[PDB]
Amino acid sequence: LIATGKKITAFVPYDGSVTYIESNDEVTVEGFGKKGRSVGDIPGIRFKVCKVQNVSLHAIFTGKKEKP
Amino acid sequence: AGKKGSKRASTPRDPFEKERLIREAQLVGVYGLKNKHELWVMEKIFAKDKERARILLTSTNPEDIPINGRSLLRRLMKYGILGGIDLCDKQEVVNGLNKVLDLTINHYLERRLQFRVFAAGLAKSVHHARLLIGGRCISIKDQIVDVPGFMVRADKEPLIEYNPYSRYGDK
Amino acid sequence: GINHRGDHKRRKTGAKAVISRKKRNNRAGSQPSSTKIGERKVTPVRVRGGNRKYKALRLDMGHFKFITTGKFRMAKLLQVVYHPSSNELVRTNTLTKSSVVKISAEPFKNDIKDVARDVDPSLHESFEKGHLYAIITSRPGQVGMAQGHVLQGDELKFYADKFN
Amino acid sequence: PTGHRDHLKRKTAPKSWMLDKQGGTFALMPASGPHKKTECIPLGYLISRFLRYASNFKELSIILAEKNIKVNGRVRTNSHFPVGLFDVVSIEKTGEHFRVLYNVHKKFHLHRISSEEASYRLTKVTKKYENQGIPYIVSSCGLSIRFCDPAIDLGYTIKISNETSKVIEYIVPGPDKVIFVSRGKARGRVGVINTISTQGKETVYGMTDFAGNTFSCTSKSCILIGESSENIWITLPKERGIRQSELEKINAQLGEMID
RNA sequence: UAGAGGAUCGAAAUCGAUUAGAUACCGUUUUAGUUCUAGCAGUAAACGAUGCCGACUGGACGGGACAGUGUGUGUUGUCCAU
RNA sequence: AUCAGGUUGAUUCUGCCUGACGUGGAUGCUAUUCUCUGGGGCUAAGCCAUGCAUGCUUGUGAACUCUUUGUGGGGGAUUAGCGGACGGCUCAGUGAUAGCACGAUGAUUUGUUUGCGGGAUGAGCAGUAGCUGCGGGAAACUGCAGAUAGUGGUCUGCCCCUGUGGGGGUUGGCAAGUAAGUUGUGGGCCUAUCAGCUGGUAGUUAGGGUAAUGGCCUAACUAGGCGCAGACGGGAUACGGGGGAUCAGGGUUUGGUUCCGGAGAGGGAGCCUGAGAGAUGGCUACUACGUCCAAGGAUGGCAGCAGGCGCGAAACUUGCCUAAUCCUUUGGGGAGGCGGUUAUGAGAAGUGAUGUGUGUGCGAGUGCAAAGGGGUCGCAUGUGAUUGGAGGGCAAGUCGGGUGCCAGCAGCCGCGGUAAUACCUGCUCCAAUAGUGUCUAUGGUGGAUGCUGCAGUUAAAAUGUCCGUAGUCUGUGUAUGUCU
C-alpha cells in the first residue's frame, strides 16, 4: 500500500485476467461489500483488484478498452 | 440564489410485483405516456388531495370546513374534475368532501392536453397529438402552447383550435 | 502589560484554566503611580475615547478644609504618618487616598482661634509645635491633586491611637 | 470582530421596506439620526420605489443634489437619511405633500395630503430634563423643545409646528379616544379606548376597531391621534386600518355558508 | 497456619494380576489427610437451574401447629379442570 | 402503519446473517437540448514563480508660466484632512471562559449622523515640507547648506477650584441615535480498567489600576469552596447556532460549507497611531524555513482572485467589466457582476410520420459595457440508445455451440466430475431509460436496545445468604385567560 506501507493480498476477478498484470505494476483495490468478512469460498482475502495502471479491468475483459 | 429544487415523482416500494406491473403497462398504453416517471408524477398529484380531505372532516377547530373546505372544492372545479356544487350549504359541501375520496387516476390523466386534442377531434390518436403539439400547431385562444402536459382548465377547454399561422392554417 | 481580564483564574470548583484568546487592548492597565512629596510634577495621559487623566508624580501644597468653620486653605505637606493598608507606604512618603499627613499650621491661624483649650486640648497642643494633621480623600493618581480636611475631636483621637 | 459594520446583506433587510430577494446582494444602510433603526426607511428608497420618480441611481442623485426634497420642511440631500412615522415629505416642483404611514399588512405607505395639513407632526413625550437653567422635553423622533407648558408628562401626544418647531397643544390619554398602533403584533390598526388597567409595571389598553372587533396592546406601541371618534387630528388612509379576518374575506368572494 | 490426637478408610508412592499396551478399573504393603481447639480462605449442578413486596381468582383427597366446637387462621404434599 | 431467503429425514421455535427502499462522498461503461442550482472542506492551519486585490478631498497653492501688468491670472508639488479596525478567505485552538434563550449596566465609553450650545483677529521670539544648490551608496535607502506658508514656545488676557493666603488649565459641552465593553441563571459528545479535588485557592477590611463592577492586582487577617443530581481527570475526525437527511406514531442520525455569532493570518510574545486594533496587503524581538549581494549590507509572509508544486481514492479560468447591487454613487473596488469548464443535484423536451419532420445550419430584429444564449420571424435541410440482468429470493429461455470439480461464477442459499435452465460464446426476451451499475459511510428495515414496547425453569440471562446508606416510591414542582 503506497499510502501506509502495509502488506495485503487481493483477488483478481475475471477469466484469464491475471496475465495482463506484471510485477512492479500499480493497481487500485477496493472492498468486497460484506462489512469486512470474506465472501464465498475465498479464504483470507478481503480485497479485490479493480484497475490496472489506470484502466478498468472489467472493460479490458469486455473488449471496450485496450491493455496498458 | 434561489432553491436547490425538489422531487416530483417517487418509486415503487418493491420493483418486481406483477399485480402492479400489469395495470401500469395499460395506462402508458391507453394514454400514450412516455415513461414511468410521468405516471408517478401524476400519482403524487392525485394523492395530495385525498390526504387533504380526510383532515378536513375530523377537525375539531370549528372554522376549517368554511375556509379550507370550500377552498379545495373551488380549486378542483376550476380544472374539470368535480361537477358543480352549491358552495353555500353545510351539507352539500361535506358530501363533496366524500366524493373527493372516491376518485380515479383517470380523472386526472384526462384533464391533460395530449388527451384533449383527441376528444375534441383534431388528431388520429394519442401518438399524433403529441407529434403536432410539439410542432406548434395548437393554440388555446391566443397562446401557442407547446408542452404536452399542460393541464387545461374548465372555462378554457372549448377554445382549442389549430394555429392560424401554421401549415395547418389559412395563412 | 497589566491586564484586568479574569480568563486565567482557577474556577469556583478548583479546576485549572483553559485559555483560547490573546490579550485585548480593551482591558489593558497601568503600573501603580507612586506620588511622593516635593516639587510638583503632574503628567497628562491619553485614555480611552480620547479623554484625559492627570497622573501626579510629586506634589506639594494640599487644599484642606477646616470643618468647624467651613473654609478652605492651601497648606504645605510635611510628611506621612499613617496608611491604613501598608505601613511600607509610610516609610516612603507615598500619597494615596486616605493616608494621614502632617501639615503646616500657619494658614489656619485665624480659624483655630474660635475653639477653646477646653474639650479639644490636643488640637491646641500640636498647633504650638507648628503643625496639624489632615487626611486625603481624593485619588492623587487619577486626578492629580491632594484634597482633604483637618482632624478634630472624634477623628483625631481615633487615629492618634494608631500612629502613637 | 470588535469594529462596527458598514454593509447590509439583502436577506437581512426589514420586511416593511418591500425589497426583492434577488436584485443584488446588498441594501442601503440607513444613517443615524431622528428615529430608531428598526422604525425608519432610507430617503433614497422613497423616491425610486414608492414614487417611481427616478429609474436609476445616477438620476436619483440628480434629484437630491439639485435640492428638490424637504423632509419636515427642511432640505435634505443625502440618500441615507432616515424617515419615520408621521413625517411630511414635500416636493416643490409639481407641488405635493405626503405623510409616511403603514398598511394593515404592516408595510410602508405614502399618503397624499393637502398644504395646510403639511404643517403638522404628532409625537410622544418620552424624556424630560433640566440643563443650564432651562426645562426641556424630548420627542419620540428625538428632538428637544424648550419652554413648553409645565404640565406635560411622559405619555402625552404633542403637536409640533413643523415650520417653527414649537408645541401647539397636546392630548392626555383616557377612555373614549383614538389610537394608532406603531409596532408589535397589531401594527397599523386604529382603535378606540375602552378600559385602562395595570399589571407589573405596565398599562394595557382595551380597544375596539371601527367595525366592532376587539383588541388589546401595551402603552408603548400606541400613539393618540384623536380626541374622539370624529375628532381625529390626521387623515387616515383609504381603508382606515380594519384588518378583516380570513373568515370574512372568503364570504366576500364566496358568500355565507348557512346550514 | 499453629498446637493436641490417631480406631477406620485412603489421594500420592509401590508391587501382583488383566492387556497388543495399560503410568487405569480389581488386589497387596504403606502415607498426607479424614477428628478436636484457635484462625485464614470465600468457592459448588451453593438447584425448584424459578428477584423481593402488594391486589384478585374453581374443585377433590390429605398432613403439621394453635384455637374453637361441627368451623377458622398461618403453612404445606398429591391429583383433575379453566 | 407490508416483508422475503438460509440450521432439519420432516416439524414448531429461539437467534442472527443476507435481499428488497432512501441520502452524502469516490469510481466503471454510455451520452442530443435548454432552464434553475453546486464544485482543493476530509490528506498538508503544507511550501509558493508572475500579474492584479486601497486610495481620495481642499477655505493648501511651490517650480514653471501668461498678460502690457496688477492686494492680476493659469499650473499643479507639498502641507492639512478623511479612509485603510469594514469587505473577502479559512476552521488550527476551544466541550463551555464560545454559542442560543430570557435578564442587569442605578457599574461604562462612543468619530461620521440629528437638534441645541460654544469659539483670542493681542504682544515678542524661535523655526519646517515642497522648492534652489552641493553629495554619498552594488543595492534598499539617505545626508548637509540656503530661503519661505501652516506651525511651536513664552508673556497678556480669558476660563476653573478657593479666599481676611493662594493654586491650576488653554477650550475639550448637553440630549437623542448608532456602535462597543462588562456581568447572572439554564441545556444528553463518549468515558469510573477516572473517587475524592483545590494555594490567589473561598471570604473580610483597606488601597492601587481601569472607560467601568470584580482576587483583576497588592498589604494585613480569617479557614474556607466543590463533589455518585458525577466533582477532578482522560479520550474521538469537537468551531456554536439558523439548518439537513430518514419517516404511521414515539424516535435515530448529521451540520468544514450561503445568513447571524466567534476565533486566526508559518509559530510565540510585545507594542505605536487612532472614536475604534493587542491590526499582520502596520512596526519591534526571539524562533521554523529561506531570498538578493560588488560580501559590507539589505530583505520575505496567497487560510484575497487566478495560477504552480506537493499530497492523496478525491475537486474549474494565470479570461472580460468606466454597465446592475452597494461601499467612499463618473475618483477607487478580483467586493460584486459576465461568460467558459465539469454526468453536483433538481425540472422540462427529443430520437420520427403518413396527407402535410418536436432536429441541425444560416439571415434579419431584439439583447448587452461588449458579447454567448434565449423567443418572434423567415431560408434551406436531415442526423440522433444505452447500462444491468434471464436456477430461487426477483420480472425474463431446460434455445444453439464450446469447456468437463478444469477454467470460471456466486451479497445469501448454491452451480461445474462428458446427461450445465447457474461458467464462456451467439441469438431471443426482461426492468428502468439520457442514463444505468460498483466500493464506502449513514436513516429505515429492528418490538434484533424495547418511554410508548422485548426477554430471563430448560434456548443468552434472577446474584450462595441476610442486614443496610444515597436515590426512586409511599406517608404528611399543575392547568388556563390576557399581555410581552
Coordinates of N, CA and C in Angstrom, one line a residue, chain D residues 4-171:
Chain D
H4 N -17.2 48.2 14.1 CA -18.5 48.3 13.5 C -18.6 47.9 12.0
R5 N -19.7 47.4 11.6 CA -20.0 47.0 10.3 C -20.6 48.1 9.5
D6 N -20.3 48.2 8.2 CA -20.8 49.3 7.3 C -21.6 48.7 6.1
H7 N -22.0 47.5 6.1 CA -22.7 46.9 4.9 C -23.9 46.2 5.5
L8 N -25.0 46.1 4.6 CA -26.1 45.3 4.8 C -26.3 44.2 3.7
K9 N -26.3 43.0 4.0 CA -26.8 42.0 3.1 C -28.3 42.1 2.9
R10 N -28.8 41.7 1.7 CA -30.2 42.0 1.4 C -31.1 41.0 2.0
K11 N -30.7 39.8 2.4 CA -31.6 38.9 3.1 C -32.0 39.5 4.5
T12 N -31.2 40.3 5.1 CA -31.5 40.8 6.4 C -32.2 42.2 6.5
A13 N -32.6 42.7 5.3 CA -33.3 44.0 5.3 C -34.7 43.8 5.9
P14 N -35.3 44.8 6.5 CA -36.6 44.7 7.1 C -37.7 44.4 6.1
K15 N -38.8 43.7 6.6 CA -39.8 43.3 5.6 C -40.7 44.5 5.2
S16 N -40.8 45.5 6.0 CA -41.5 46.7 5.7 C -41.0 47.5 4.5
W17 N -39.8 47.2 4.1 CA -39.2 48.0 3.0 C -39.6 47.5 1.6
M18 N -40.1 46.3 1.6 CA -40.6 45.6 0.4 C -39.5 45.6 -0.7
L19 N -38.4 44.9 -0.4 CA -37.3 44.7 -1.3 C -37.3 43.3 -1.9
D20 N -36.9 43.2 -3.2 CA -36.9 41.9 -3.8 C -35.7 41.1 -3.4
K21 N -36.0 39.8 -3.2 CA -35.0 38.9 -2.7 C -33.7 38.9 -3.5
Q22 N -33.9 38.7 -4.8 CA -32.8 38.9 -5.8 C -32.7 40.4 -6.0
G23 N -31.9 40.8 -7.1 CA -31.6 42.2 -7.3 C -30.4 42.7 -6.7
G24 N -29.4 41.9 -6.5 CA -28.2 42.2 -5.8 C -28.0 41.5 -4.5
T25 N -26.8 41.7 -3.9 CA -26.5 41.1 -2.6 C -26.6 42.1 -1.5
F26 N -26.7 43.4 -1.7 CA -26.7 44.4 -0.7 C -27.9 45.3 -0.7
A27 N -28.1 46.1 0.4 CA -29.2 47.0 0.6 C -28.6 48.3 1.2
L28 N -29.3 49.4 1.0 CA -28.9 50.7 1.5 C -28.8 50.7 3.0
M29 N -27.7 51.1 3.6 CA -27.7 51.2 5.0 C -28.1 52.6 5.5
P30 N -29.1 52.7 6.4 CA -29.5 54.0 6.9 C -28.5 54.6 7.8
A31 N -28.6 55.9 7.9 CA -27.7 56.7 8.8 C -28.3 56.8 10.2
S32 N -27.6 57.3 11.1 CA -28.1 57.7 12.4 C -29.0 58.9 12.4
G33 N -29.6 59.2 13.4 CA -30.4 60.4 13.5 C -31.8 60.3 14.2
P34 N -32.8 60.9 13.5 CA -34.1 61.1 14.2 C -34.7 59.9 14.8
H35 N -35.1 58.9 14.0 CA -35.9 57.8 14.6 C -35.0 56.6 14.9
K36 N -35.5 55.6 15.5 CA -34.7 54.3 15.7 C -34.5 53.6 14.4
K37 N -33.6 52.6 14.5 CA -33.2 51.9 13.3 C -34.2 50.9 12.8
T38 N -34.9 50.3 13.7 CA -36.0 49.4 13.3 C -37.3 50.1 12.9
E39 N -37.3 51.4 12.9 CA -38.5 52.2 12.6 C -38.2 53.3 11.6
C40 N -37.5 53.0 10.6 CA -37.3 54.1 9.6 C -37.0 53.4 8.2
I41 N -37.0 54.2 7.2 CA -36.6 53.8 5.9 C -35.7 54.8 5.2
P42 N -34.7 54.4 4.5 CA -33.8 55.4 3.9 C -34.5 56.3 2.9
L43 N -34.1 57.5 2.8 CA -34.8 58.5 2.0 C -34.7 58.1 0.5
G44 N -33.6 57.4 0.1 CA -33.5 57.1 -1.3 C -34.4 56.1 -1.9
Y45 N -35.0 55.2 -1.0 CA -35.9 54.3 -1.5 C -37.3 54.9 -1.7
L46 N -37.6 55.9 -0.9 CA -38.9 56.6 -1.1 C -39.1 57.4 -2.4
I47 N -38.0 57.7 -3.0 CA -38.0 58.5 -4.2 C -37.9 57.7 -5.5
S48 N -37.6 56.4 -5.4 CA -37.4 55.5 -6.5 C -38.2 54.2 -6.5
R49 N -38.9 53.9 -5.4 CA -39.7 52.7 -5.4 C -41.2 53.0 -5.0
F50 N -41.4 54.1 -4.2 CA -42.7 54.4 -3.7 C -43.3 55.6 -4.5
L51 N -42.5 56.3 -5.2 CA -43.0 57.3 -6.2 C -42.5 57.0 -7.6
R52 N -41.5 56.1 -7.8 CA -41.0 55.7 -9.1 C -40.6 56.9 -9.9
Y53 N -40.1 58.0 -9.3 CA -39.7 59.2 -10.0 C -38.4 58.9 -10.7
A54 N -37.3 58.5 -10.0 CA -36.1 58.1 -10.6 C -36.0 56.6 -10.9
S55 N -35.5 56.3 -12.1 CA -35.5 54.9 -12.5 C -34.1 54.3 -12.3
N56 N -33.2 55.0 -11.6 CA -31.8 54.7 -11.7 C -31.2 55.0 -10.3
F57 N -29.9 55.2 -10.3 CA -29.2 55.9 -9.2 C -28.4 57.1 -9.7
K58 N -28.0 57.1 -10.9 CA -27.5 58.4 -11.5 C -28.5 59.4 -11.5
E59 N -29.8 59.1 -11.7 CA -30.9 60.0 -11.7 C -31.3 60.4 -10.3
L60 N -31.5 59.4 -9.4 CA -31.8 59.7 -8.0 C -30.9 60.7 -7.4
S61 N -29.6 60.7 -7.8 CA -28.7 61.6 -7.2 C -28.6 63.0 -8.0
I62 N -29.3 63.1 -9.1 CA -29.6 64.4 -9.7 C -30.8 65.1 -9.1
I63 N -31.7 64.3 -8.5 CA -32.8 64.9 -7.8 C -32.5 65.4 -6.4
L64 N -31.5 64.8 -5.8 CA -31.2 65.1 -4.4 C -30.1 66.2 -4.3
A65 N -29.2 66.2 -5.3 CA -28.1 67.2 -5.4 C -28.6 68.5 -6.0
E66 N -29.7 68.5 -6.7 CA -30.4 69.8 -7.1 C -31.3 70.4 -6.1
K67 N -31.4 69.8 -4.9 CA -32.1 70.3 -3.7 C -33.6 70.5 -4.0
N68 N -34.3 69.3 -4.3 CA -35.7 69.3 -4.6 C -36.5 68.6 -3.5
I69 N -36.0 68.2 -2.4 CA -36.7 67.4 -1.4 C -36.6 68.1 -0.1
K70 N -37.6 68.0 0.8 CA -37.6 68.6 2.1 C -38.4 67.7 3.0
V71 N -37.7 67.1 4.0 CA -38.3 66.3 5.0 C -38.6 67.1 6.2
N72 N -39.9 67.2 6.5 CA -40.3 68.1 7.6 C -39.9 69.5 7.4
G73 N -40.2 70.0 6.2 CA -39.8 71.4 5.9 C -38.4 71.8 6.1
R74 N -37.5 71.0 5.5 CA -36.0 71.2 5.7 C -35.3 70.4 4.7
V75 N -34.5 71.1 3.9 CA -33.9 70.4 2.7 C -32.9 69.3 3.1
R76 N -33.0 68.2 2.4 CA -32.2 67.1 2.6 C -31.6 66.7 1.3
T77 N -30.3 66.3 1.3 CA -29.6 65.9 0.1 C -28.8 64.6 0.2
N78 N -29.1 63.8 1.2 CA -28.5 62.6 1.5 C -29.4 61.4 1.3
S79 N -29.0 60.4 0.6 CA -29.9 59.3 0.3 C -30.0 58.3 1.4
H80 N -29.1 58.4 2.5 CA -29.2 57.5 3.6 C -29.9 58.1 4.8
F81 N -30.5 59.3 4.6 CA -31.2 60.0 5.7 C -32.5 59.2 6.1
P82 N -32.7 58.9 7.4 CA -33.9 58.1 7.8 C -35.2 58.8 8.0
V83 N -36.3 58.3 7.5 CA -37.6 58.9 7.6 C -38.5 57.9 8.4
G84 N -39.3 58.5 9.3 CA -40.1 57.7 10.2 C -41.6 57.9 10.1
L85 N -42.3 57.6 11.2 CA -43.8 57.6 11.1 C -44.3 59.0 11.4
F86 N -45.3 59.4 10.6 CA -46.0 60.7 10.6 C -45.0 61.8 10.2
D87 N -44.3 61.7 9.1 CA -43.4 62.7 8.6 C -43.8 63.2 7.3
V88 N -43.6 64.5 7.0 CA -44.1 65.1 5.8 C -43.0 65.2 4.8
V89 N -43.2 64.8 3.6 CA -42.2 64.9 2.5 C -42.8 65.8 1.4
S90 N -42.1 66.9 1.1 CA -42.6 68.0 0.2 C -41.7 68.0 -1.0
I91 N -42.3 68.3 -2.1 CA -41.6 68.4 -3.4 C -42.1 69.7 -4.1
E92 N -41.2 70.7 -4.3 CA -41.6 72.0 -4.7 C -42.2 72.0 -6.2
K93 N -41.3 71.6 -7.1 CA -41.9 71.5 -8.5 C -42.9 70.3 -8.5
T94 N -44.0 70.5 -9.1 CA -45.1 69.6 -9.1 C -45.6 69.5 -7.6
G95 N -46.0 70.7 -7.0 CA -46.3 70.8 -5.6 C -47.1 69.7 -5.0
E96 N -46.5 69.0 -4.1 CA -47.2 67.8 -3.5 C -46.7 67.7 -2.0
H97 N -47.5 66.9 -1.3 CA -47.1 66.6 0.1 C -47.6 65.2 0.4
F98 N -46.8 64.5 1.2 CA -47.1 63.1 1.6 C -46.9 63.0 3.1
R99 N -47.5 62.0 3.7 CA -47.3 61.6 5.0 C -46.9 60.1 5.0
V100 N -46.0 59.7 5.9 CA -45.5 58.3 6.0 C -46.3 57.6 7.0
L101 N -46.8 56.4 6.5 CA -47.8 55.6 7.3 C -47.4 54.2 7.2
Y102 N -48.3 53.3 7.7 CA -48.2 51.9 7.5 C -49.5 51.4 6.8
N103 N -49.4 50.1 6.3 CA -50.6 49.4 5.8 C -51.3 48.8 7.0
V104 N -52.2 47.9 6.7 CA -52.7 46.9 7.7 C -51.9 45.6 7.5
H105 N -51.2 45.4 6.4 CA -50.2 44.4 6.2 C -48.8 44.7 6.8
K106 N -48.7 45.9 7.4 CA -47.5 46.3 8.1 C -46.4 46.7 7.2
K107 N -46.7 47.1 6.0 CA -45.7 47.7 5.1 C -45.7 49.2 5.2
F108 N -44.8 49.9 4.5 CA -44.9 51.3 4.5 C -45.9 51.8 3.4
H109 N -46.2 53.1 3.5 CA -47.3 53.7 2.7 C -47.1 55.2 2.6
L110 N -47.2 55.7 1.4 CA -47.2 57.2 1.3 C -48.6 57.7 1.0
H111 N -49.1 58.6 1.8 CA -50.5 59.1 1.7 C -50.5 60.6 1.3
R112 N -51.0 60.9 0.2 CA -51.1 62.3 -0.2 C -52.0 63.1 0.6
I113 N -51.6 64.3 0.9 CA -52.3 65.3 1.8 C -52.3 66.6 1.1
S114 N -52.9 67.6 1.8 CA -53.1 69.0 1.4 C -51.9 69.8 1.9
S115 N -52.0 71.1 1.7 CA -51.0 72.0 2.1 C -51.1 72.6 3.5
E116 N -52.3 72.9 4.0 CA -52.4 73.3 5.4 C -52.5 72.1 6.3
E117 N -52.4 70.9 5.8 CA -52.1 69.7 6.7 C -50.7 69.3 6.7
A118 N -49.8 69.9 5.8 CA -48.4 69.6 5.8 C -47.6 70.5 6.7
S119 N -48.2 71.0 7.7 CA -47.6 71.8 8.7 C -47.7 71.2 10.1
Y120 N -47.8 69.9 10.2 CA -48.1 69.2 11.4 C -47.0 68.1 11.7
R121 N -47.1 67.6 12.9 CA -46.4 66.4 13.3 C -47.0 66.0 14.6
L122 N -47.1 64.7 14.9 CA -47.5 64.2 16.2 C -46.4 63.3 16.7
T123 N -46.1 63.5 18.0 CA -45.1 62.6 18.6 C -45.5 62.4 20.1
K124 N -44.8 61.5 20.7 CA -45.0 61.2 22.1 C -43.9 61.8 23.0
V125 N -44.2 62.2 24.2 CA -43.1 62.7 25.1 C -42.5 61.5 25.9
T126 N -41.2 61.3 25.8 CA -40.5 60.2 26.4 C -39.6 60.6 27.6
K127 N -38.9 61.7 27.5 CA -37.9 62.1 28.5 C -38.2 63.5 28.9
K128 N -37.5 63.9 30.0 CA -37.7 65.3 30.5 C -36.5 65.6 31.4
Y129 N -35.8 66.7 31.1 CA -34.6 67.1 31.9 C -34.4 68.6 31.9
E130 N -33.5 69.0 32.8 CA -33.2 70.4 33.1 C -31.7 70.6 32.9
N131 N -31.3 71.6 32.1 CA -29.9 71.8 31.9 C -29.6 73.3 31.7
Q132 N -28.6 73.9 32.4 CA -28.2 75.2 32.2 C -29.2 76.3 32.7
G133 N -30.3 75.9 33.3 CA -31.3 76.8 33.7 C -32.4 76.9 32.7
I134 N -32.8 75.7 32.1 CA -33.9 75.7 31.1 C -34.5 74.3 31.2
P135 N -35.9 74.2 31.1 CA -36.5 72.9 31.1 C -36.8 72.4 29.7
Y136 N -36.5 71.1 29.5 CA -36.7 70.5 28.2 C -37.7 69.3 28.3
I137 N -38.1 69.0 27.1 CA -38.9 67.7 26.9 C -38.4 67.1 25.6
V138 N -38.3 65.8 25.6 CA -37.7 65.0 24.4 C -38.9 64.3 23.7
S139 N -38.9 64.5 22.4 CA -39.8 63.8 21.5 C -39.5 62.3 21.3
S140 N -40.3 61.7 20.5 CA -40.1 60.3 20.2 C -39.3 60.1 18.9
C141 N -39.3 61.2 18.1 CA -38.3 61.3 16.9 C -37.0 61.9 17.3
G142 N -36.9 62.4 18.6 CA -35.6 62.7 19.1 C -35.2 64.1 19.5
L143 N -36.2 65.0 19.2 CA -35.9 66.5 19.4 C -36.1 66.9 20.9
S144 N -35.5 68.0 21.2 CA -35.7 68.7 22.5 C -36.5 70.0 22.2
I145 N -37.5 70.3 23.0 CA -38.2 71.5 22.9 C -38.1 72.2 24.3
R146 N -37.8 73.5 24.3 CA -37.6 74.2 25.5 C -38.8 75.2 25.7
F147 N -39.1 75.5 26.9 CA -40.1 76.4 27.3 C -41.5 75.9 26.7
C148 N -41.9 74.8 27.2 CA -43.2 74.3 27.0 C -44.1 74.5 28.3
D149 N -45.3 74.0 28.3 CA -46.1 74.0 29.5 C -45.4 73.2 30.6
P150 N -45.7 73.6 31.8 CA -45.2 72.8 33.0 C -46.0 71.6 33.3
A151 N -47.1 71.3 32.5 CA -48.0 70.2 32.8 C -48.0 69.3 31.6
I152 N -46.9 68.9 31.1 CA -46.8 67.9 30.0 C -45.8 66.8 30.6
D153 N -46.3 65.6 30.6 CA -45.6 64.5 31.2 C -45.4 63.3 30.2
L154 N -44.8 62.2 30.7 CA -44.5 61.1 29.9 C -45.7 60.4 29.4
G155 N -45.9 60.3 28.1 CA -47.0 59.6 27.5 C -47.9 60.4 26.6
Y156 N -48.0 61.7 26.9 CA -48.9 62.6 26.2 C -48.4 62.8 24.7
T157 N -49.4 63.0 23.8 CA -49.1 63.3 22.5 C -49.0 64.8 22.3
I158 N -48.0 65.3 21.5 CA -47.8 66.7 21.3 C -47.9 67.0 19.8
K159 N -48.2 68.2 19.5 CA -48.3 68.6 18.1 C -47.2 69.7 17.8
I160 N -46.3 69.3 16.9 CA -45.1 70.2 16.6 C -45.4 71.0 15.4
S161 N -44.9 72.2 15.4 CA -45.3 73.2 14.4 C -44.8 72.8 13.0
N162 N -43.6 72.3 12.9 CA -43.1 71.8 11.6 C -42.6 72.9 10.7
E163 N -42.9 74.2 11.1 CA -42.3 75.3 10.4 C -41.6 76.3 11.3
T164 N -41.9 76.2 12.6 CA -41.1 76.9 13.6 C -40.6 75.9 14.7
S165 N -41.1 74.6 14.7 CA -40.7 73.6 15.7 C -41.0 74.0 17.1
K166 N -42.3 74.2 17.4 CA -42.8 74.6 18.7 C -44.1 73.9 19.0
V167 N -44.4 73.6 20.2 CA -45.6 72.9 20.6 C -46.8 73.8 20.4
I168 N -47.9 73.1 20.0 CA -49.2 73.9 19.8 C -50.2 73.5 20.9
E169 N -50.6 72.2 20.9 CA -51.4 71.6 22.0 C -51.2 70.1 22.0
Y170 N -51.8 69.5 23.0 CA -51.5 68.1 23.3 C -52.7 67.3 23.6
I171 N -52.6 66.0 23.9 CA -53.6 65.1 24.3 C -53.2 64.3 25.5

